[PDB]
Design an enzyme around this catalytic site. Structure first.
Site, short mmCIF file in Angstrom:
data_model
loop_
_atom_site.label_atom_id
_atom_site.label_comp_id
_atom_site.label_asym_id
_atom_site.label_seq_id
_atom_site.Cartn_x
_atom_site.Cartn_y
_atom_site.Cartn_z
N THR A 30 0.86 -1.04 -0.17
CA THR A 30 0.27 -0.04 0.39
C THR A 30 1.15 1.34 -0.30
O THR A 30 1.41 1.23 1.36
CB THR A 30 -1.32 0.29 1.77
OG1 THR A 30 -1.73 -1.21 1.58
CG2 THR A 30 -2.16 1.54 1.23
N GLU A 63 10.16 -6.98 -2.47
CA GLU A 63 10.93 -5.29 -3.74
C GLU A 63 12.06 -6.12 -4.12
O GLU A 63 12.54 -4.97 -4.76
CB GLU A 63 10.52 -4.71 -2.97
CG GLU A 63 8.80 -4.05 -3.12
CD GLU A 63 8.32 -4.61 -1.44
OE1 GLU A 63 6.77 -4.22 -1.57
OE2 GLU A 63 8.79 -5.11 -0.49
N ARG A 113 4.99 7.80 0.14
CA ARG A 113 4.73 6.57 2.20
C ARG A 113 6.01 6.86 3.36
O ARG A 113 7.20 7.05 2.81
CB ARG A 113 4.26 5.04 2.04
CG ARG A 113 3.88 4.80 2.83
CD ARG A 113 3.04 3.04 3.24
NE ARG A 113 3.63 2.34 3.59
CZ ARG A 113 2.97 1.11 4.11
NH1 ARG A 113 2.61 0.74 2.84
NH2 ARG A 113 3.61 0.40 5.25
N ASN A 995 -4.72 -8.21 3.77
CA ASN A 995 -4.49 -6.98 4.18
C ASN A 995 -4.40 -6.06 3.21
O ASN A 995 -4.64 -4.47 2.98
CB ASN A 995 -4.27 -6.63 5.53
CG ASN A 995 -2.99 -6.17 5.34
OD1 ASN A 995 -1.93 -5.83 6.33
ND2 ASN A 995 -2.21 -7.10 4.79
C1 LIG Z 1 9.09 -5.08 2.54
C2 LIG Z 1 7.71 -4.79 2.93
N1 LIG Z 1 6.84 -4.90 1.35
C3 LIG Z 1 5.40 -4.62 1.55
C4 LIG Z 1 4.54 -4.53 2.75
C5 LIG Z 1 3.59 -4.71 2.34
N2 LIG Z 1 2.60 -6.17 3.46
C6 LIG Z 1 2.13 -5.82 4.71
S1 LIG Z 1 1.14 -7.04 5.48
C7 LIG Z 1 1.24 -7.44 3.38
C8 LIG Z 1 0.54 -8.94 2.63
C9 LIG Z 1 0.11 -10.14 4.01
O1 LIG Z 1 0.07 -11.04 4.22
P1 LIG Z 1 0.51 -12.42 4.40
O2 LIG Z 1 1.41 -12.20 5.22
O3 LIG Z 1 -0.47 -13.59 4.03
O4 LIG Z 1 -0.86 -12.19 5.93
P2 LIG Z 1 -2.45 -11.91 6.34
O5 LIG Z 1 -2.63 -10.77 5.62
O6 LIG Z 1 -2.58 -12.92 5.23
O7 LIG Z 1 -2.44 -12.66 7.81
C10 LIG Z 1 1.98 -6.83 2.25
C11 LIG Z 1 2.07 -6.71 0.79
C12 LIG Z 1 5.97 -4.66 3.99
N3 LIG Z 1 5.16 -3.62 5.22
N4 LIG Z 1 7.69 -4.34 4.47
S1 SF4 Z 2 -10.58 -12.30 7.78
FE1 SF4 Z 2 -9.15 -12.11 8.80
S2 SF4 Z 2 -7.07 -12.83 7.71
FE2 SF4 Z 2 -8.69 -12.22 6.18
S3 SF4 Z 2 -8.55 -9.61 5.88
FE3 SF4 Z 2 -10.47 -9.89 7.78
S4 SF4 Z 2 -8.95 -9.73 9.48
FE4 SF4 Z 2 -7.42 -10.21 7.63
#
Ligand SMILES: Cc1ncc(C[n+]2csc(CCOP(=O)(O)OP(=O)(O)O)c2C)c(N)n1
Ligand code: SF4
Ligand SMILES: Cc1ncc(C[n+]2csc(CCOP(=O)(O)OP(=O)(O)O)c2C)c(N)n1
Ligand code: SF4
Ligand code: SF4
Ligand SMILES: [Ca+2]
Ligand SMILES: [Mg+2]
Ligand SMILES: [Mg+2]
Lengths: 1231, 117, 235, 59, 118, 58
Positions: A30, A63, A113, A995
């Site tokens: 984001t 990245e 950001r 998220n």
């Molecule tokens: C270097 C860096 N790249 C990208 C992000 C953005 N980012 C934060 S959470 C996320 C995805 C969440 O993935 P996951 O581990 O599968 O957990 P979930 O939300 O499904 O529990 C991303 C792409 C960041 N904070 N820092």
């Molecule tokens: S259901 Fe839970 S894991 Fe999925 S978007 Fe909502 S807070 Fe995140």
């Protein structure tokens, strides 16, 4: 050709980025994910770039991998780009030096950001882009949506001809998510500006074995310096190329620019020098004050790097006596921020006139930069002349902020209608606002602007939208605080939010509520609101949109009623054309099902236009009696910090109100009691069997089982119905399930799983429960939790434990929180948590709400979020500290054992020492020691006393999602699990980056639909469990609450107790998966997940191998065959079966096969009597040995790399053959 | 492509200083760690041997499907597929949907049959 | 007690680093590899730091991994340190913001080395240290082998009392690999210069379920800005 | 030998380390071209991105 | 015309062979996250890892590729964790070609692998 | 008549400490930076020095 287009910065630059790029390697983050998701979609749809080819986009693990992929492509001769921001841009830095060093026409599109220091932020500022200013990248900034497009084009064109990489950046959210009616260019126009000769040369110098060369050499002190200066000519010419294209894109669009642009009075005495979306607002204020005779100006910087001083002084008025440079960053310790320094060096090097130069910081983390603030800045120049000042906050600690007079007259262009909308998440408000933008803008000759402020609450959150319309360009890059139209789409906000603030007099305010009578209106509407509605002669329009939405058969959805309100009362279009042009859109959208659904939305429009009648309120309102305060119990933190924040008043919270290190106290979500659920569960003590499954399941701890005796239920409500405990240990006790109706998100899980045929839990309307339950909850909440009555790690006994993580900002029926909650009920009092970035860190650490809490002793999880890529490492660090420190304690304890310590002290000291790493024992002797050494403050014992918080063994956990574990942070996870140390990682597998929008991870299954999986993922789910099981000494196991809570408790026990690395993967249902029957079926879906064989449960316990037993154990049974019906129940699979049935059938077929083969594989893995052994440690013993000692031939080279202090000894460098060969040569030359 | 261990492990390791220095300075540990390595290579082979004799093996497929035309994971979804967060915020997002605060489908349907009026 | 001896800039600083630190996550990278190797060896040897304890050192998969570990150890109330340079330092930038953002007394010892751009170079210059001037770390430069030792000590002592993370750096090879006859300080001496109260408070504010708090939140535009200014007094 | 089989048509994403040191320490370049001028396109990005660097070449 | 453009792309005619070199330090540690991802991409790239079971170039430091009891810097008393099985870890994908070689043992086997893998 | 100002603490950059070492006699001063930031109007140490004089206002 041109084309009026209403969009935001992201889509605007992405439009240009796609056309000018052949290859793109991205990673979601984001607020740049949009762009990255644009490209992919457009490519899938069949979009063509300026070469008639669809862009080749791929997703990396981070990245870093992205920037690395780009480099390779650029080096290989392909026009590449990528979209990133904040934390993502920081991981691209290293490659940036390389990409710039090898002069590559690469281009980065970053949404400026904030960087995560004291706290993480997904909002805009220039902390990141400034952090990459020395990578050798050109930096072209855009200050508006239109500019986003324009500067994005110039960036590519310039890069191609300059061979210098460009970083086009624009304010995150403030420009990227702001929508305006702008002009875009055709792909043909763009392609016709490209420098063909340059493009041909780029491809000719690129890597190719047909005419190879070598890049990435290693140079010594003799040539490095020269080689580094070899690109000077290139960097000198880039400003020219940049100006060149600003002039060429100008000849096509009519919009001109310069590296530096000046605006304001020709003879301005006070000039501001800013960069970004802030400039738009400045100019707005300039036009207003300058027209009044004020001599002030502004220097807009477009090209930040290279920084051409000439161009600077070009736009700088000689009349300037005072000029303040504004930096949207914060470099702690610097003598001044980036731009400020560049500007200073400019004047100093000019060595002539020296106008007073001030420095000012602003907009950190999308902080509002109002015209009032722009006023405060221009006044500071003609007054106090304060230097190194802040604008937008109250610095009462170091006093550097500027006084801001919010009573500043509105400066928006004449004839502009600024609007505000207060809607609830998922009610249609926003989607309806965006439609109002497309319509009006694409049918009228008005300029349109849109911006939205969402809520950290993933469910039932507030959404205040901001829309503007005018005949003149909209440069208002800041919220609306002087609206002409204010609409509250939720009656709930009425008495909890300052809905009417700065609302222009005579302005209209349409409200959504069933209070059509003055009796109700007066009964529900506050005096402050009534008083305002009267004092400002507002045109208050009430409307029962819910009722009206039910009469027409629209289910009751007020999205098409409030939309009709806008077009009729907002006064942007003539009543006639306004309502008329609307009905035309009703057909445009929808139409998904005949004219029936289209008729229901047409009837709604009319019957609404009819209902929209001004509420003739009495003049008696002008002085209505204000109610009295009556806020329940609360801290001075929930009262002085969190509530002012939760109530959209955080901006007025001075700097002194926060912890310098940015920390928050636990249990702050204990007073939120939002109560945004529609339906809640109703306990039925006539069907209940006292199993505690409803509590175990709750994703928000909204179910409190009570086990007390009549001794404690004396002063309780007569309706606090309680049964009599069932079992042995539970005899005289009285059982009860207290529903927390206010903290309940109304997901429906509990009732959905409640065992008895005649459910002991029935879903009923919130309002039909709260009045009788809320008071019973506040009572039951005061009943001592019976933790020593039943086995802590038992199903029915774990719910008799304190949940140290309640009421989080997670969605209703989240598949994650249910797990973590019960995890705190087993170790919460003695555990550390290194939460990887993502949802797990969003519903748990989003300020000011903190779900994690402390128990009755004040003990609770020591929570912390470092980064997204270092959860394991981070937590591994916490483990090293404890070791280092606990080992310290143990050594002092040993000391005291030899000193003259008392008999008692020595016993506990001796005991603790024996179970130092035993939760039970370490706590038994630890507490005895506390009592015994209480008050001590001298010698060893005095030190051993000061370390009571190290006595009992701590439990280190790593919380993360599949994205973190399988991608970004897999490398650290892998490495830490290999460390062979006592740490526990819990991975909530939602099989997708949640998220951030639901992007595809290597954990995403086959045929699943996610971002960058636009047609079902065409790669199998990465097997993280089997990869780590290859270590032999790492404890691995999979769980699925819905299938077997009993097996889940066992896993946590065996994992956490294991004296080494532990990896637990949990199948967590998520709204991105799109369950057809709702998240209330989550538990039932986790169940199917295991039965179908989609997610088989198992456990690899190494210590079993240490005893001749097979370390692998299967906890589930072979697939049952319900897989097909399992996949088709989730939209993430059903979608393909609807748009691409041919591939869908094949993909779901490949999946079933996948799980069929893998299971048989696991079975045989559980059958085999051949397995890897296991050995804890033992050995060590002080003493080191270098791999060189006693070697016959040299063990190190001549290089400066292997050189060490003690190295430099003569040795056989192997240039005389083998020992034997040498030995023989000696015999073959006898002499 | 190779055969089972031949027992030359000890001479192989001791012939290399990276191991021999450990034996000269830590005789006790050396022998255990050397005797341990020997056990590892023996186990991993029989382990590798089963792979060579298993009747179960993961299938394979070059690449296919995809083609033109994409689709979003939220289209057709009965309940909301994105939260209220500014993070999941997209250009096209913002439509009305069930945010799962009304309970399960069947729960909702039955909640109406019990009210009617 | 003053003590004459010949050595290179590397060991000179490692000498102090070891004594003043309790934990350390390290990854190898020229020309700072020598320090991490000495700290590891001396650890195996059984050398005691000021607290009379052997240093707890671990090697990660990368510097981004070392930084993550270094962050956790500090957030867990343990005096931590690391040695890096050039490319290694750049992989620590993210964490550096966190470490300084949370006002942790971390201390980096870097051998200023050039950055890989048009070409790679293991030789010294200030390209790396500068790339992290905005991370919020105090920067202490030493211009000679003798100064490498002195600043190395000051850096640790200051960080502990100011709660601001320090980055001690010196020219790679030109100083880190330049041996001179200098004067070092017994560990006992170094220990007597530590601010016990400051140290005691570092133990206090740190992470621990016995007295928990939450760090690393996510803040909106309403307060993020002010929060970033809250540490102005410390700087 | 690898170059004796695919040398005249291969790209090389080489991770920093010995293979990069003896691979391209200026001014000594071991990789050469055959009688037709064809040879390995050698390039060293960074130490931690060898795979993604080569992957991008593939892209 | 088309031929004009085509003609200028002769350097693309012949199918290229993308390779990736790197020591164990790269593949097993710092670069693993990337190697694992690129390999899982399923695209046509070849990764050749010259396993030295140690960070040679920089002074022989230990890595996850280092064997049990192996004496290396950061393993001053012999490594106390086994060698990381990179091979078996990547073999779980099922769609990735994996092989181990040893020229001293068999040059024919080595050639066979280059032929097949490439 | 020459001199040199050694900078031990680069961050935070305390303008006061700096001038404490600047000889009033100084008529010409050249700042040396061991780095190169392409396109930058100047290198780090240099930039910080200029900011010090422009703010000394003399
Ligand atoms: C270097 C860096 N790249 C990208 C992000 C953005 N980012 C934060 S959470 C996320 C995805 C969440 O993935 P996951 O581990 O599968 O957990 P979930 O939300 O499904 O529990 C991303 C792409 C960041 N904070 N820092
Ligand atoms: S259901 Fe839970 S894991 Fe999925 S978007 Fe909502 S807070 Fe995140
Ligand atoms: C970010 C980063 N960290 C550390 C280094 C230093 N470094 C380069 S090669 C190397 C050894 C790893 O080499 P390896 O891949 O194992 O191959 P070998 O030299 O042993 O053949 C190290 C520590 C670097 N260049 N960049
Ligand atoms: S799930 Fe049902 S039967 Fe079980 S404790 Fe809860 S209300 Fe009672
Ligand atoms: S409906 Fe959901 S949130 Fe509400 S009490 Fe039941 S499980 Fe908890
Ligand atoms: Ca464990
Ligand atoms: Mg996920
Ligand atoms: Mg190696």
């Amino acid at each position: 050709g041109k084309k009026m287009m209403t969009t935001d910065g992201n889509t605007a630059t992405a439009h240009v980025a796609y056309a000018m790029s052949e290859v793109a390697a991205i990673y979601p983050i984001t607020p740049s994910s949009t762009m990255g998701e644009e490209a992919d979609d457009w490519a899938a749809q069949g979009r063509k770039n300026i070469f008639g080819q669809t862009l080749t986009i791929r997703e990396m693990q981070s990245e870093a991998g992205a920037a690395g992929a780009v480099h390779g492509a650029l080096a290989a001769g392909a026009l590449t780009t990528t979209f990133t921001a904040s934390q993502g841009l920081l991981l691209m830095i290293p490659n940036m030096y390389k990409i710039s060093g090898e002069l590559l026409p690469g281009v980065f599109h970053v949404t400026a950001r904030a960087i995560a220091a004291h706290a993480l932020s997904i909002f805009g500022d220039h902390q990141d882009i400034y952090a990459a200013r020395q990578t050798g990248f050109a930096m072209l900034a855009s200050s508006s949506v239109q500019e986003a497009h324009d500067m994005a084009l110039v960036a590519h064109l310039a890069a191609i001809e300059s061979n210098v990489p460009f970083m086009h950046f624009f304010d995150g959210f403030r420009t990227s998510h702001e929508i305006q009616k702008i002009e875009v260019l055709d792909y043909a126009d763009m392609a016709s500006l490209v420098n063909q000769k340059a493009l041909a040369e780029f491809r000719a110098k690129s890597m190719n074995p047909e005419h190879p060369h070598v890049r990435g050499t290693a140079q010594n002190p003799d040539i490095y310096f020269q080689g580094r200066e070899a690109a000077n000519p290139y960097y000198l010419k880039v400003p020219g190329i940049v100006a060149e294209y600003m002039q060429k894109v100008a000849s096509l669009t009519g919009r001109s620019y310069k590296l530096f642009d000046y605006v304001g009075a020709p003879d301005a005495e006070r000039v501001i020098v800013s960069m970004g979306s802030s400039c738009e607002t400045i100019e707005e204020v300039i036009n207003h004050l300058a027209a009044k005779g004020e001599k002030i100006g502004l220097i807009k910087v477009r090209l930040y790097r290279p920084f051409v001083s000439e161009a600077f002084f070009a736009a700088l008025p000689a009349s300037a006596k005072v000029i303040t440079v504004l930096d949207r960053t914060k470099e702690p310790g610097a003598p001044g921020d980036p731009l400020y320094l560049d500007v200073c060096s400019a004047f100093v090097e000019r060595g002539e006139a020296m106008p007073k130069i001030l420095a000012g910081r602003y907009g950190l983390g999308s902080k509002e930069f109002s015209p009032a603030m722009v006023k405060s800045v221009y006044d500071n120049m003609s007054g106090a002349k304060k230097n190194h000042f802040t604008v937008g906050i109250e610095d009462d600690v170091t006093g550097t902020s500027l006084p801001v007079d919010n009573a500043f007259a509105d400066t928006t262009p004449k004839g502009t209608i600024q609007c505000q909308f207060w809607g609830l998440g998922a009610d249609g408000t926003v989607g309806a606002n965006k439609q109002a933008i497309k319509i009006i803008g694409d049918n009228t000759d008005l300029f349109a602007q849109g911006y939205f402020s969402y809520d950290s609450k993933k469910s039932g959150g507030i959404t205040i939208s901001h829309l503007r319309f005018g005949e003149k360009p909209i440069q208002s890059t800041y919220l609306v605080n002087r609206a002409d139209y204010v609409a509250c789409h939720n009656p709930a906000y009425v008495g909890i939010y300052d809905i009417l603030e700065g609302i222009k007099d005579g302005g209209t305010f349409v409200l959504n509520s069933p209070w059509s009578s003055l009796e109700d209106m007066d009964k529900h509407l506050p005096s402050g609101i009534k008083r305002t509605i009267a004092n400002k002669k507002l045109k208050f329009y009430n409307i029962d949109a819910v009722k009206i939405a039910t009469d027409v058969g629209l289910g009751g959805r007020i999205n098409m009623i409030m939309q009709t309100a806008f077009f009729k009362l907002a006064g942007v279009l003539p009543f006639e054309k306004a309502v008329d042009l609307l009905k035309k859109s009703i057909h445009k959208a929808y139409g998904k099902k005949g004219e029936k659904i289209v008729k229901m939305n047409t009837d709604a429009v009319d019957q609404a236009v009819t209902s929209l009648q001004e509420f003739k309120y009495p003049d008696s309102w002008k002085d209505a009696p204000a109610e009295t305060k009556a806020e329940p119990m609360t801290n001075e933190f929930f009262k002085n910090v969190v509530k002012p924040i939760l109530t959209q008043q955080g901006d007025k919270l001075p700097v002194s109100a926060f912890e310098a290190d940015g920390r928050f106290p636990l249990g702050t979500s204990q007073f939120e009691k939002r109560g945004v659920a529609i339906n809640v569960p109703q306990w039925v003590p006539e069907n209940c069997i006292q199993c505690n499954q409803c509590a175990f399941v709750c994703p928000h701890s909204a179910i409190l089982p009570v086990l007390a005796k009549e001794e404690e239920l004396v002063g309780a409500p007569a309706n606090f119905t309680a049964l009599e405990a069932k079992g042995k240990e539970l005899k005289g006790y009285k059982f009860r399930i207290q529903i927390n109706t206010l903290d309940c998100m109304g997901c429906g899980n509990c009732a959905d799983i409640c065992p008895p045929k005649e459910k002991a839990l029935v879903m009923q309307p919130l309002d039909t429960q709260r009045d009788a339950q809320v008071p019973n909850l506040e009572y039951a909440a005061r009943i001592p939790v019976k933790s020593e009555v039943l086995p802590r790690d038992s199903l029915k006994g774990s719910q008799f434990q304190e949940p140290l993580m309640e009421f989080s900002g997670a969605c209703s029926g989240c598949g994650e929180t249910p797990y973590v909650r019960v995890i705190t009920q087993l170790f919460g009092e003695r555990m550390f948590i290194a939460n990887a970035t993502g949802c797990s860190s969003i519903w748990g650490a989003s300020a000011p709400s903190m779900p994690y809490k402390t128990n009755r002793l004040g003990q609770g999880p020591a929570w912390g979020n470092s980064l997204f890529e270092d959860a394991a490492e981070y937590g591994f660090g916490m483990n090293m500290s404890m070791f280092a420190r606990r080992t310290h304690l143990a050594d002092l304890a040993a000391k005291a054992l030899e000193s003259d310590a008392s008999g008692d002290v020595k016993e506990a000291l001796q005991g603790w020492l024996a179970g130092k790493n035993d939760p039970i024992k370490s706590k038994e002797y630890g507490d005895k020691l506390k009592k015994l050494l209480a008050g001590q403050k001298d010698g060893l014992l005095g030190q051993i006393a000061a370390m009571s918080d190290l006595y009992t063994k701590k439990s280190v956990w790593i919380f993360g999602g599949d994205g973190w574990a399988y991608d970004i942070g897999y490398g650290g996870l892998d490495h830490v699990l290999a460390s062979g140390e006592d740490v526990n990682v819990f991975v909530m597998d939602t099989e997708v980056y949640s998220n951030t929008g639901g992007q595809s991870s290597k954990a995403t299954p086959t045929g699943a639909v996610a971002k960058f999986a636009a047609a079902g993922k065409r790669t199998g789910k990465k097997d993280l469990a089997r990869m780590v099981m290859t270590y032999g000494y790492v404890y691995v196991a999979t769980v699925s609450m819905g299938y077997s809570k009993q097996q889940f408790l066992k896993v946590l026990k065996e994992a956490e107790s294991f004296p080494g690395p532990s990896l637990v993967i949990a199948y967590a249902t998520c709204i991105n998966q799109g369950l057809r029957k709702g998240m209330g079926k989550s538990q039932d879906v986790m169940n199917t997940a295991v039965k179908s064989g989609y997610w088989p449960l198992f456990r690899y316990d190494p210590r079993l191998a240490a005893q001749g037993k097979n370390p692998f154990q299967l906890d589930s049974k072979a697939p049952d065959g319900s897989v097909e019906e399992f996949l088709m129940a989730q939209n993430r699979f059903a979608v393909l079966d609807r748009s691409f049935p041919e591939d869908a059938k094949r993909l779901r077929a490949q999946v079933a096969h996948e799980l069929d083969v893998r299971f048989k594989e696991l079975e045989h893995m559980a059958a085999t009597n051949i397995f890897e052994s296991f050995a804890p440690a033992g050995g060590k013993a002080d003493g080191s040995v270098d791999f060189g000692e006693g070697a016959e031939f040299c063990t190190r080279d001549d290089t400066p790399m292997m050189a060490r202090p003690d190295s430099g000894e003569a040795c056989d460098q192997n240039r005389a053959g083998t020992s034997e060969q040498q030995g023989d040569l000696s015999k073959r030359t006898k002499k």
